[PDB]
Amino acid sequence: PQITLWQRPLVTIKIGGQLKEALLDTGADDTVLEEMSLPGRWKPKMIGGIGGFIKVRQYDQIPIEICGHKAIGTVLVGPTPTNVIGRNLLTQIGCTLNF
């Protein structure tokens, strides 16, 4: 698709068999979702934004569908204000910026 930016670029994702809404976010290196359950072991990560840092749980090699496009990669879980799909997965689904 081609997605304009007059509204937030919110898309439906599927992870762990559940649908969620998430923001396609070229300003995010990584993908960070609100608290949820994922399988396996996790590692610690600190990620910084406008208001400072939060601590998240890092899960690797997680299947996730983004607008129906299949990806498998790193998902961070923690107290983010909104679900954000960052460049780690935007590159998997072949997303670019164009103008």
Ligand X SMILES: C/N=c1/[nH]c2ccc(S(=O)(=O)N(CC(C)C)C[C@@H](O)[C@H](Cc3ccccc3)NC(=O)O[C@H]3CO[C@H]4OC[C@H](OCC(=O)NC)[C@H]43)cc2o1
Residue 97 as a binder of a copy of itself (CB under 8 A): the answer is yes
**Any catalytic annotation for residue 25?**
yes
Q: Are 59 and 42 in contact (CB under 8 A)?
A: yes
**Per-residue binding letters, 38-57, with ligand X (x by CB under 6 A):** ---------xxxx-------
Whole-number CA gyration radius for the chain? 13
Q: How far apart are alpha carbons 30 and 86 in whole angstroms?
A: 4
Helix (H, G, I), strand (E, B) or coil at 80: coil
Residue choice 15, 21, 25, 37 for contact with a copy of itself (CB under 8 A)? 25
Which residue do the tokens 């559940």 mark?
18
Chosen from Cl ion, a copy of itself, ligand X, none, partner binding at 30 (C-beta under 5 to 8 Å by type): ligand X
Please state the closest distance from residue 37 (CB atom) to a copy of itself, in A: 21
7-10's contacts with Cβ under 8 Å and 24+ in sequence apart are none
> Interface residues with a copy of itself (CB under 8 A)?
1-6, 8-9, 23-29, 32, 47-54, 67, 69, 80-81, 84, 87, 90-91, 93-99
